[PDB]
PDB file of C-alpha atoms in Angstrom:
ATOM      1  CA  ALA A  55      61.584  37.797 163.231  1.00  0.00           C
ATOM      2  CA  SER A  56      59.580  35.770 165.779  1.00  0.00           C
ATOM      3  CA  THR A  57      58.526  37.568 168.931  1.00  0.00           C
ATOM      4  CA  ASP A  58      58.929  35.780 172.263  1.00  0.00           C
ATOM      5  CA  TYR A  59      57.318  37.912 175.000  1.00  0.00           C
ATOM      6  CA  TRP A  60      53.751  38.825 175.899  1.00  0.00           C
ATOM      7  CA  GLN A  61      53.259  41.999 177.817  1.00  0.00           C
ATOM      8  CA  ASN A  62      49.827  42.250 179.529  1.00  0.00           C
ATOM      9  CA  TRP A  63      49.492  44.548 182.602  1.00  0.00           C
ATOM     10  CA  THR A  64      46.531  46.440 184.024  1.00  0.00           C
ATOM     11  CA  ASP A  65      46.114  48.233 187.418  1.00  0.00           C
ATOM     12  CA  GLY A  66      42.649  46.707 187.578  1.00  0.00           C
ATOM     13  CA  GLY A  67      40.631  49.725 186.364  1.00  0.00           C
ATOM     14  CA  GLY A  68      37.565  49.208 184.062  1.00  0.00           C
ATOM     15  CA  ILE A  69      37.833  46.655 181.256  1.00  0.00           C
ATOM     16  CA  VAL A  70      41.019  45.812 179.350  1.00  0.00           C
ATOM     17  CA  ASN A  71      40.388  42.930 176.951  1.00  0.00           C
ATOM     18  CA  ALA A  72      43.722  41.728 175.671  1.00  0.00           C
ATOM     19  CA  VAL A  73      44.110  38.897 173.219  1.00  0.00           C
ATOM     20  CA  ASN A  74      47.425  37.095 172.673  1.00  0.00           C
ATOM     21  CA  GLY A  75      46.870  36.340 168.990  1.00  0.00           C
ATOM     22  CA  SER A  76      48.630  34.302 166.323  1.00  0.00           C
ATOM     23  CA  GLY A  77      52.490  34.792 166.236  1.00  0.00           C
ATOM     24  CA  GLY A  78      53.198  38.504 166.534  1.00  0.00           C
ATOM     25  CA  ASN A  79      49.554  39.688 166.557  1.00  0.00           C
ATOM     26  CA  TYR A  80      47.570  41.191 169.416  1.00  0.00           C
ATOM     27  CA  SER A  81      44.375  43.104 170.030  1.00  0.00           C
ATOM     28  CA  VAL A  82      43.198  45.232 172.925  1.00  0.00           C
ATOM     29  CA  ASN A  83      39.661  46.401 173.521  1.00  0.00           C
ATOM     30  CA  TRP A  84      39.414  48.631 176.549  1.00  0.00           C
ATOM     31  CA  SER A  85      36.890  50.915 178.266  1.00  0.00           C
ATOM     32  CA  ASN A  86      36.745  53.108 181.370  1.00  0.00           C
ATOM     33  CA  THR A  87      40.217  51.957 182.346  1.00  0.00           C
ATOM     34  CA  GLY A  88      42.875  52.997 184.787  1.00  0.00           C
ATOM     35  CA  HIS A  89      46.386  52.605 183.467  1.00  0.00           C
ATOM     36  CA  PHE A  90      47.419  49.559 181.516  1.00  0.00           C
ATOM     37  CA  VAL A  91      50.203  48.404 179.132  1.00  0.00           C
ATOM     38  CA  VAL A  92      49.814  45.523 176.585  1.00  0.00           C
ATOM     39  CA  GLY A  93      52.098  44.397 173.741  1.00  0.00           C
ATOM     40  CA  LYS A  94      54.373  41.885 172.000  1.00  0.00           C
ATOM     41  CA  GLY A  95      58.114  41.838 171.736  1.00  0.00           C
ATOM     42  CA  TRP A  96      61.208  40.260 173.183  1.00  0.00           C
ATOM     43  CA  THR A  97      62.065  39.493 176.873  1.00  0.00           C
ATOM     44  CA  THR A  98      65.564  40.863 176.304  1.00  0.00           C
ATOM     45  CA  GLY A  99      65.849  44.149 174.446  1.00  0.00           C
ATOM     46  CA  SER A 100      68.861  45.120 172.377  1.00  0.00           C
ATOM     47  CA  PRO A 101      70.232  48.567 171.467  1.00  0.00           C
ATOM     48  CA  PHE A 102      70.776  47.085 168.010  1.00  0.00           C
ATOM     49  CA  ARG A 103      67.294  45.756 167.461  1.00  0.00           C
ATOM     50  CA  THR A 104      65.192  46.841 164.445  1.00  0.00           C
ATOM     51  CA  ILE A 105      61.406  46.545 165.096  1.00  0.00           C
ATOM     52  CA  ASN A 106      58.751  46.047 162.345  1.00  0.00           C
ATOM     53  CA  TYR A 107      55.007  46.482 163.155  1.00  0.00           C
ATOM     54  CA  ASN A 108      51.699  47.047 161.387  1.00  0.00           C
ATOM     55  CA  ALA A 109      48.913  48.529 163.446  1.00  0.00           C
ATOM     56  CA  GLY A 110      45.814  47.319 161.616  1.00  0.00           C
ATOM     57  CA  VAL A 111      43.658  49.111 164.173  1.00  0.00           C
ATOM     58  CA  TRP A 112      44.608  52.315 166.014  1.00  0.00           C
ATOM     59  CA  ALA A 113      41.410  53.729 167.581  1.00  0.00           C
ATOM     60  CA  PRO A 114      41.868  55.245 171.038  1.00  0.00           C
ATOM     61  CA  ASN A 115      38.906  57.240 172.492  1.00  0.00           C
ATOM     62  CA  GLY A 116      40.841  59.508 174.821  1.00  0.00           C
ATOM     63  CA  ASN A 117      44.425  59.068 176.049  1.00  0.00           C
ATOM     64  CA  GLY A 118      46.391  56.074 174.627  1.00  0.00           C
ATOM     65  CA  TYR A 119      49.970  55.656 173.174  1.00  0.00           C
ATOM     66  CA  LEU A 120      51.183  53.503 170.263  1.00  0.00           C
ATOM     67  CA  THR A 121      54.761  52.962 171.300  1.00  0.00           C
ATOM     68  CA  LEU A 122      58.021  51.009 171.553  1.00  0.00           C
ATOM     69  CA  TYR A 123      58.311  50.444 175.254  1.00  0.00           C
ATOM     70  CA  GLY A 124      61.023  48.755 177.371  1.00  0.00           C
ATOM     71  CA  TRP A 125      63.356  48.819 180.333  1.00  0.00           C
ATOM     72  CA  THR A 126      66.942  48.377 181.363  1.00  0.00           C
ATOM     73  CA  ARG A 127      68.245  47.503 184.837  1.00  0.00           C
ATOM     74  CA  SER A 128      71.754  48.632 186.177  1.00  0.00           C
ATOM     75  CA  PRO A 129      70.532  51.304 186.426  1.00  0.00           C
ATOM     76  CA  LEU A 130      66.774  51.333 186.080  1.00  0.00           C
ATOM     77  CA  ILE A 131      65.408  53.194 182.979  1.00  0.00           C
ATOM     78  CA  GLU A 132      61.991  53.031 181.312  1.00  0.00           C
ATOM     79  CA  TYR A 133      62.086  54.167 177.615  1.00  0.00           C
ATOM     80  CA  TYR A 134      59.648  55.038 174.751  1.00  0.00           C
ATOM     81  CA  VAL A 135      59.514  55.477 171.078  1.00  0.00           C
ATOM     82  CA  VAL A 136      56.148  56.985 170.489  1.00  0.00           C
ATOM     83  CA  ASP A 137      54.804  56.743 166.998  1.00  0.00           C
ATOM     84  CA  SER A 138      51.148  57.633 167.647  1.00  0.00           C
ATOM     85  CA  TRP A 139      48.819  58.704 170.439  1.00  0.00           C
ATOM     86  CA  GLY A 140      45.231  59.696 171.270  1.00  0.00           C
ATOM     87  CA  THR A 141      43.958  63.022 172.627  1.00  0.00           C
ATOM     88  CA  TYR A 142      47.288  63.609 174.528  1.00  0.00           C
ATOM     89  CA  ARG A 143      50.933  63.960 173.205  1.00  0.00           C
ATOM     90  CA  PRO A 144      53.432  62.943 175.975  1.00  0.00           C
ATOM     91  CA  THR A 145      56.442  65.275 176.665  1.00  0.00           C
ATOM     92  CA  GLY A 146      59.092  66.042 179.346  1.00  0.00           C
ATOM     93  CA  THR A 147      62.378  67.976 179.455  1.00  0.00           C
ATOM     94  CA  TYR A 148      63.378  68.775 175.867  1.00  0.00           C
ATOM     95  CA  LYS A 149      66.810  67.543 174.897  1.00  0.00           C
ATOM     96  CA  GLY A 150      66.790  67.934 171.069  1.00  0.00           C
ATOM     97  CA  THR A 151      65.645  66.032 167.950  1.00  0.00           C
ATOM     98  CA  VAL A 152      66.277  62.803 165.973  1.00  0.00           C
ATOM     99  CA  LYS A 153      65.302  61.857 162.404  1.00  0.00           C
ATOM    100  CA  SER A 154      64.539  58.111 161.984  1.00  0.00           C
ATOM    101  CA  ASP A 155      62.376  56.050 159.560  1.00  0.00           C
ATOM    102  CA  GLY A 156      60.748  58.947 157.742  1.00  0.00           C
ATOM    103  CA  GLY A 157      59.790  60.832 160.926  1.00  0.00           C
ATOM    104  CA  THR A 158      61.191  63.619 163.119  1.00  0.00           C
ATOM    105  CA  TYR A 159      61.051  62.899 166.908  1.00  0.00           C
ATOM    106  CA  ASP A 160      61.572  65.170 169.968  1.00  0.00           C
ATOM    107  CA  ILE A 161      63.862  63.775 172.687  1.00  0.00           C
ATOM    108  CA  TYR A 162      62.780  64.298 176.296  1.00  0.00           C
ATOM    109  CA  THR A 163      63.779  63.072 179.746  1.00  0.00           C
ATOM    110  CA  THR A 164      61.546  62.654 182.836  1.00  0.00           C
ATOM    111  CA  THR A 165      62.045  61.599 186.422  1.00  0.00           C
ATOM    112  CA  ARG A 166      59.480  59.383 188.164  1.00  0.00           C
ATOM    113  CA  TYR A 167      59.366  59.582 191.936  1.00  0.00           C
ATOM    114  CA  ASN A 168      57.415  57.337 194.358  1.00  0.00           C
ATOM    115  CA  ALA A 169      56.657  55.239 191.297  1.00  0.00           C
ATOM    116  CA  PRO A 170      56.168  51.501 190.409  1.00  0.00           C
ATOM    117  CA  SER A 171      59.348  50.008 188.756  1.00  0.00           C
ATOM    118  CA  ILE A 172      59.299  47.081 186.245  1.00  0.00           C
ATOM    119  CA  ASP A 173      58.954  44.945 189.377  1.00  0.00           C
ATOM    120  CA  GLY A 174      56.083  46.975 190.863  1.00  0.00           C
ATOM    121  CA  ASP A 175      57.888  48.345 193.953  1.00  0.00           C
ATOM    122  CA  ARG A 176      57.961  52.158 194.370  1.00  0.00           C
ATOM    123  CA  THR A 177      61.274  54.066 193.931  1.00  0.00           C
ATOM    124  CA  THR A 178      62.753  56.921 191.818  1.00  0.00           C
ATOM    125  CA  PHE A 179      63.912  56.404 188.167  1.00  0.00           C
ATOM    126  CA  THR A 180      64.468  58.224 184.880  1.00  0.00           C
ATOM    127  CA  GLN A 181      62.536  57.781 181.627  1.00  0.00           C
ATOM    128  CA  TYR A 182      63.873  58.424 178.116  1.00  0.00           C
ATOM    129  CA  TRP A 183      61.489  59.394 175.317  1.00  0.00           C
ATOM    130  CA  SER A 184      61.520  59.887 171.580  1.00  0.00           C
ATOM    131  CA  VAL A 185      58.025  61.190 170.644  1.00  0.00           C
ATOM    132  CA  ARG A 186      57.130  61.744 166.980  1.00  0.00           C
ATOM    133  CA  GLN A 187      56.404  65.429 166.125  1.00  0.00           C
ATOM    134  CA  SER A 188      53.065  64.548 164.384  1.00  0.00           C
ATOM    135  CA  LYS A 189      51.362  61.155 164.412  1.00  0.00           C
ATOM    136  CA  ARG A 190      52.742  58.398 162.144  1.00  0.00           C
ATOM    137  CA  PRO A 191      50.207  57.118 159.701  1.00  0.00           C
ATOM    138  CA  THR A 192      48.913  53.587 160.663  1.00  0.00           C
ATOM    139  CA  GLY A 193      47.763  50.429 158.815  1.00  0.00           C
ATOM    140  CA  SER A 194      50.798  49.869 156.553  1.00  0.00           C
ATOM    141  CA  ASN A 195      54.205  48.293 157.588  1.00  0.00           C
ATOM    142  CA  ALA A 196      56.350  50.553 159.713  1.00  0.00           C
ATOM    143  CA  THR A 197      59.922  50.212 160.993  1.00  0.00           C
ATOM    144  CA  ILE A 198      61.396  51.677 164.167  1.00  0.00           C
ATOM    145  CA  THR A 199      65.172  51.801 163.838  1.00  0.00           C
ATOM    146  CA  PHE A 200      65.986  51.648 167.567  1.00  0.00           C
ATOM    147  CA  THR A 201      69.766  52.152 167.219  1.00  0.00           C
ATOM    148  CA  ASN A 202      69.048  55.616 165.691  1.00  0.00           C
ATOM    149  CA  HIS A 203      67.299  56.479 168.941  1.00  0.00           C
ATOM    150  CA  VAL A 204      69.946  54.796 171.114  1.00  0.00           C
ATOM    151  CA  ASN A 205      72.641  56.883 169.312  1.00  0.00           C
ATOM    152  CA  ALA A 206      70.855  60.201 169.511  1.00  0.00           C
ATOM    153  CA  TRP A 207      69.994  59.664 173.160  1.00  0.00           C
ATOM    154  CA  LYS A 208      73.763  59.014 173.908  1.00  0.00           C
ATOM    155  CA  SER A 209      74.720  62.420 172.249  1.00  0.00           C
ATOM    156  CA  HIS A 210      72.280  64.063 174.768  1.00  0.00           C
ATOM    157  CA  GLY A 211      73.704  62.356 177.860  1.00  0.00           C
ATOM    158  CA  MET A 212      71.061  59.659 177.994  1.00  0.00           C
ATOM    159  CA  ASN A 213      72.855  56.379 178.521  1.00  0.00           C
ATOM    160  CA  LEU A 214      70.980  53.065 178.743  1.00  0.00           C
ATOM    161  CA  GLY A 215      71.648  50.332 181.309  1.00  0.00           C
ATOM    162  CA  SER A 216      73.813  47.289 180.737  1.00  0.00           C
ATOM    163  CA  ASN A 217      71.289  44.616 181.698  1.00  0.00           C
ATOM    164  CA  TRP A 218      68.375  44.754 179.195  1.00  0.00           C
ATOM    165  CA  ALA A 219      64.875  43.732 180.172  1.00  0.00           C
ATOM    166  CA  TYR A 220      61.863  43.411 177.807  1.00  0.00           C
ATOM    167  CA  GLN A 221      61.176  45.493 174.682  1.00  0.00           C
ATOM    168  CA  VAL A 222      57.714  45.479 173.090  1.00  0.00           C
ATOM    169  CA  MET A 223      55.522  47.378 170.579  1.00  0.00           C
ATOM    170  CA  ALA A 224      52.722  48.458 173.000  1.00  0.00           C
ATOM    171  CA  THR A 225      49.266  49.953 173.589  1.00  0.00           C
ATOM    172  CA  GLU A 226      49.370  51.989 176.837  1.00  0.00           C
ATOM    173  CA  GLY A 227      46.292  53.823 178.031  1.00  0.00           C
ATOM    174  CA  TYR A 228      45.472  56.315 180.761  1.00  0.00           C
ATOM    175  CA  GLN A 229      41.842  56.558 182.034  1.00  0.00           C
ATOM    176  CA  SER A 230      40.385  56.094 178.549  1.00  0.00           C
ATOM    177  CA  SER A 231      38.510  53.744 176.193  1.00  0.00           C
ATOM    178  CA  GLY A 232      39.449  52.231 172.772  1.00  0.00           C
ATOM    179  CA  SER A 233      40.516  49.507 170.265  1.00  0.00           C
ATOM    180  CA  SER A 234      43.852  48.487 168.763  1.00  0.00           C
ATOM    181  CA  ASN A 235      45.225  45.688 166.681  1.00  0.00           C
ATOM    182  CA  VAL A 236      49.076  45.550 166.279  1.00  0.00           C
ATOM    183  CA  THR A 237      51.297  42.907 164.573  1.00  0.00           C
ATOM    184  CA  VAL A 238      54.991  42.731 165.571  1.00  0.00           C
ATOM    185  CA  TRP A 239      57.971  41.163 163.785  1.00  0.00           C
TER     186      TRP A 239
END
Protein backbone atom coordinates (compact mmCIF):
# COMPACT_ATOMS: atom_id res chain seq x y z
CA ALA A 1 0.00 0.00 0.00
CA SER A 2 1.05 3.65 -0.46
CA THR A 3 2.24 5.48 2.62
CA ASP A 4 0.98 9.02 3.23
CA TYR A 5 2.85 10.48 6.24
CA TRP A 6 6.41 11.61 6.86
CA GLN A 7 7.59 11.57 10.40
CA ASN A 8 10.75 13.68 11.00
CA TRP A 9 11.41 15.00 14.56
CA THR A 10 14.63 15.87 16.37
CA ASP A 11 15.18 17.74 19.70
CA GLY A 12 18.02 19.57 17.97
CA GLY A 13 20.94 17.48 19.29
CA GLY A 14 23.95 16.69 16.99
CA ILE A 15 23.25 15.74 13.38
CA VAL A 16 20.18 13.85 12.16
CA ASN A 17 20.20 13.64 8.36
CA ALA A 18 16.81 12.41 7.25
CA VAL A 19 15.88 11.87 3.64
CA ASN A 20 12.26 11.56 2.48
CA GLY A 21 12.96 9.15 -0.37
CA SER A 22 10.98 7.66 -3.24
CA GLY A 23 7.46 6.34 -2.22
CA GLY A 24 7.83 4.40 1.02
CA ASN A 25 11.64 4.71 1.32
CA TYR A 26 13.66 6.70 3.84
CA SER A 27 17.19 6.97 5.15
CA VAL A 28 18.62 8.45 8.32
CA ASN A 29 22.26 9.20 8.97
CA TRP A 30 22.82 10.49 12.46
CA SER A 31 25.70 11.28 14.83
CA ASN A 32 26.15 12.63 18.36
CA THR A 33 22.41 13.15 18.63
CA GLY A 34 19.93 13.88 21.35
CA HIS A 35 16.62 12.14 20.89
CA PHE A 36 14.95 11.95 17.52
CA VAL A 37 12.22 9.95 15.70
CA VAL A 38 12.02 9.55 11.86
CA GLY A 39 9.83 7.30 9.71
CA LYS A 40 7.12 6.67 7.10
CA GLY A 41 3.57 5.54 7.57
CA TRP A 42 0.02 6.76 7.71
CA THR A 43 -1.41 9.92 9.42
CA THR A 44 -4.28 7.84 10.79
CA GLY A 45 -3.40 4.51 12.35
CA SER A 46 -5.76 1.56 12.44
CA PRO A 47 -5.97 -1.38 14.87
CA PHE A 48 -6.55 -3.50 11.77
CA ARG A 49 -3.57 -2.34 9.78
CA THR A 50 -0.93 -4.81 8.50
CA ILE A 51 2.51 -3.17 7.98
CA ASN A 52 5.18 -4.44 5.51
CA TYR A 53 8.79 -3.07 5.66
CA ASN A 54 12.28 -3.95 4.49
CA ALA A 55 15.15 -2.39 6.38
CA GLY A 56 17.93 -2.42 3.80
CA VAL A 57 20.23 -0.79 6.34
CA TRP A 58 20.07 -1.27 10.12
CA ALA A 59 23.35 0.04 11.59
CA PRO A 60 22.99 1.88 14.90
CA ASN A 61 26.24 2.73 16.80
CA GLY A 62 24.81 2.88 20.30
CA ASN A 63 21.14 3.20 21.31
CA GLY A 64 18.55 3.17 18.45
CA TYR A 65 15.18 1.32 17.90
CA LEU A 66 13.71 -0.17 14.71
CA THR A 67 10.04 0.05 15.52
CA LEU A 68 6.35 0.47 14.70
CA TYR A 69 5.52 3.68 16.47
CA GLY A 70 2.22 5.60 16.85
CA TRP A 71 -0.29 7.35 19.05
CA THR A 72 -3.94 7.51 19.94
CA ARG A 73 -5.80 10.44 21.51
CA SER A 74 -8.95 10.02 23.81
CA PRO A 75 -7.04 9.09 25.85
CA LEU A 76 -3.42 9.75 25.01
CA ILE A 77 -1.25 6.60 24.43
CA GLU A 78 2.13 6.22 22.72
CA TYR A 79 2.76 2.61 21.47
CA TYR A 80 5.63 0.46 20.05
CA VAL A 81 6.28 -2.69 18.22
CA VAL A 82 9.98 -3.12 18.47
CA ASP A 83 11.55 -5.46 16.00
CA SER A 84 15.22 -4.49 16.43
CA TRP A 85 17.45 -2.23 18.51
CA GLY A 86 21.06 -1.19 19.15
CA THR A 87 23.10 -1.56 22.35
CA TYR A 88 19.90 -1.20 24.51
CA ARG A 89 16.68 -3.37 24.66
CA PRO A 90 13.71 -1.24 25.92
CA THR A 91 11.45 -2.70 28.70
CA GLY A 92 8.87 -1.63 31.34
CA THR A 93 6.30 -3.42 33.52
CA TYR A 94 5.96 -6.99 32.22
CA LYS A 95 2.44 -7.98 31.28
CA GLY A 96 2.98 -11.26 29.35
CA THR A 97 3.84 -12.45 25.81
CA VAL A 98 2.51 -12.46 22.21
CA LYS A 99 3.54 -14.57 19.20
CA SER A 100 3.22 -12.69 15.86
CA ASP A 101 4.94 -12.98 12.42
CA GLY A 102 7.52 -15.59 13.36
CA GLY A 103 8.64 -13.80 16.55
CA THR A 104 7.89 -13.90 20.29
CA TYR A 105 7.41 -10.43 21.91
CA ASP A 106 7.25 -9.33 25.59
CA ILE A 107 4.38 -6.98 26.49
CA TYR A 108 5.18 -4.08 28.83
CA THR A 109 3.51 -0.90 30.05
CA THR A 110 5.18 2.37 31.14
CA THR A 111 4.02 5.69 32.50
CA ARG A 112 5.63 8.94 31.31
CA TYR A 113 5.40 11.89 33.66
CA ASN A 114 6.35 15.54 32.96
CA ALA A 115 6.78 14.40 29.37
CA PRO A 116 6.26 15.83 25.81
CA SER A 117 2.97 14.50 24.22
CA ILE A 118 2.44 14.07 20.43
CA ASP A 119 1.81 17.82 20.51
CA GLY A 120 4.97 18.65 22.48
CA ASP A 121 3.33 19.94 25.69
CA ARG A 122 4.32 18.20 28.97
CA THR A 123 1.77 15.98 30.80
CA THR A 124 1.42 12.37 32.08
CA PHE A 125 0.55 9.42 29.74
CA THR A 126 0.90 5.66 29.35
CA GLN A 127 2.96 3.77 26.75
CA TYR A 128 2.24 0.27 25.44
CA TRP A 129 5.09 -1.90 24.15
CA SER A 130 5.60 -5.17 22.35
CA VAL A 131 9.40 -5.74 22.22
CA ARG A 132 10.80 -8.76 20.35
CA GLN A 133 12.65 -11.24 22.64
CA SER A 134 15.75 -11.32 20.33
CA LYS A 135 16.38 -9.04 17.36
CA ARG A 136 14.51 -9.72 14.10
CA PRO A 137 16.81 -10.35 11.21
CA THR A 138 16.91 -7.35 8.75
CA GLY A 139 17.28 -6.84 4.96
CA SER A 140 14.47 -9.13 3.73
CA ASN A 141 10.66 -8.31 3.69
CA ALA A 142 9.06 -8.37 7.10
CA THR A 143 5.42 -8.06 8.21
CA ILE A 144 4.11 -6.68 11.49
CA THR A 145 0.59 -7.97 12.06
CA PHE A 146 -0.62 -5.10 14.27
CA THR A 147 -4.03 -6.61 15.13
CA ASN A 148 -2.18 -9.52 16.85
CA HIS A 149 -0.61 -6.93 19.13
CA VAL A 150 -3.85 -4.95 19.54
CA ASN A 151 -5.61 -8.20 20.61
CA ALA A 152 -2.97 -9.38 23.03
CA TRP A 153 -2.69 -5.94 24.60
CA LYS A 154 -6.55 -5.94 25.19
CA SER A 155 -6.29 -9.35 27.08
CA HIS A 156 -3.76 -7.60 29.42
CA GLY A 157 -5.94 -4.55 30.13
CA MET A 158 -4.22 -2.32 27.61
CA ASN A 159 -6.94 -0.59 25.65
CA LEU A 160 -6.14 1.85 22.82
CA GLY A 161 -7.84 5.22 22.28
CA SER A 162 -10.72 5.85 19.92
CA ASN A 163 -9.20 8.70 17.93
CA TRP A 164 -6.13 7.35 16.06
CA ALA A 165 -3.20 9.58 15.20
CA TYR A 166 -0.18 8.61 13.03
CA GLN A 167 1.41 5.16 12.73
CA VAL A 168 4.87 4.77 11.17
CA MET A 169 7.77 2.28 10.81
CA ALA A 170 10.49 4.36 12.59
CA THR A 171 14.15 4.90 13.51
CA GLU A 172 14.30 6.39 17.04
CA GLY A 173 17.63 7.14 18.65
CA TYR A 174 18.85 8.20 22.08
CA GLN A 175 22.24 10.01 22.37
CA SER A 176 23.86 7.83 19.71
CA SER A 177 25.21 7.68 16.14
CA GLY A 178 24.23 5.51 13.10
CA SER A 179 22.69 4.69 9.67
CA SER A 180 19.38 3.19 8.57
CA ASN A 181 17.48 2.67 5.38
CA VAL A 182 13.83 1.45 5.71
CA THR A 183 11.13 0.94 3.01
CA VAL A 184 7.46 0.90 4.11
CA TRP A 185 4.36 -0.45 2.35
